[PDB]
């Protein structure tokens, strides 16, 4: 195997590690069906400030998914759930948070950061003023918000409250101080993963060498050289007649490249015999 020589880190223009108060500094979080959207754009982020705060206590990513960042905008989503509905903040996994309140995208997946608010966001009668959707005529697709402040028809027929046998779309959580951990209000920041990049620097195009490379949406080792492929302006990269990518439009300077793999192969040994000699020649 030919051992590579060089690093190729190519990206569009670079900003610094920005501070994000929407990640770790927000004090009051609203309901989950009307989950507050704040976003992250154009910053090389690590989200170590998820860990680095005195406002949170869980520190888990859905935690190797913390560095899962060389894509479009991350949405730091602010809402308070219950302990039995911490479990439903997930890509898919259609519980009462995911099917109707807050569904998560599934290209990459961020971090769900809860915090113990037994003494602030709860009461002994149940802080029922925070609510959630449990049944609605229509399921959420991923990354949606539901701000229907409306008395709801439970079957699609004109049965709205305050008429009889007509249901509300909102149950109470049951944020009790007198219960255990399963019924506590938990201030939850979710980084919805659907332009930031974690390992985002800029290095040189080490062309015509067995290198490493890290691109906008493309990693691997190989040989780099300009290409002549008629890329469309809406086409990022090329693939071969097989299904691995061998051509890329450069993330930094848009030069259409080729990606051949590094050279490799077998080894023979041509010997005439130990009784004959002790020299060999290899193929």
């Amino acid at each position: 195997r030919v051992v590579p020589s060089g690093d190729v880190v190519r990206f569009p223009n670079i900003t610094n590690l920005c501070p994000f108060g929407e990640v770790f500094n927000a004090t009051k979080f609203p309901s989950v069906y009307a989950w507050e959207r704040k976003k992250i754009s154009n910053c090389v982020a690590d989200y170590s400030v998820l860990y680095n705060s005195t406002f949170f206590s869980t520190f888990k990513c859905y935690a190797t998914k913390l560095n899962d960042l060389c894509f479009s905008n991350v949405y730091a989503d602010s809402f308070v759930v219950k302990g039995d509905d911490v479990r439903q903040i997930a890509p898919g996994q259609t519980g009462v948070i995911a099917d109707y309140n807050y569904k998560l995208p599934d290209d990459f997946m961020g971090c769900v950061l809860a915090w113990n608010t037994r003494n602030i966001d709860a009461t002994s009668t149940g802080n029922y003023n925070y609510k959630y959707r449990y049944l609605r005529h229509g399921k959420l697709r991923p990354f949606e918000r539901d701000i229907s402040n409306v008395p709801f028809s439970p079957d699609g027929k004109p049965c709205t409250p305050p008429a009889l046998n007509c249901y509300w779309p909102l149950n109470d959580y049951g944020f009790y101080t007198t219960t255990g951990i399963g019924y506590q209000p938990y201030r939850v920041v979710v980084l919805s993963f659907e332009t930031v990049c974690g390992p985002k620097l800029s290095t040189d195009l080490i062309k015509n060498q067995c290198v490493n490379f890290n691109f906008n949406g493309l990693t691997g080792t190989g040989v780099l050289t300009p290409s002549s492929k008629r890329f469309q302006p809406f086409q990022q990269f090329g693939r071969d007649v097989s299904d691995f990518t061998d051509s890329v439009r450069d993330p930094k300077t848009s030069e259409i490249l080729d990606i051949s793999p590094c050279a490799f192969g077998g080894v023979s040994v041509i010997t005439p015999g130990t009784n004959a000699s002790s020299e060999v020649a290899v193929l």
Binding site: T64, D68, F108, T219, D243
Partner: protein, 48 residues
């Protein structure tokens, strides 16, 4: 042509892993999430 392409397309079989990509399973998932699904795609591709 067929026996190469059948050998080609069975690279892209998941074999019970979360993807058929050994470097996503390497890099994107946890190191306990990795070796579970590294050991799946080898035994799949080895007997393919």
């Amino acid at each position: 042509a067929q026996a190469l392409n059948t050998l080609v397309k069975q690279l892209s079989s998941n074999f019970g892993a979360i993807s058929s990509v050994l470097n996503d399973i390497l890099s994107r998932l946890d190191p306990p999430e990795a070796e579970v699904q590294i050991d799946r795609l080898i035994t799949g591709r080895l007997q393919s």
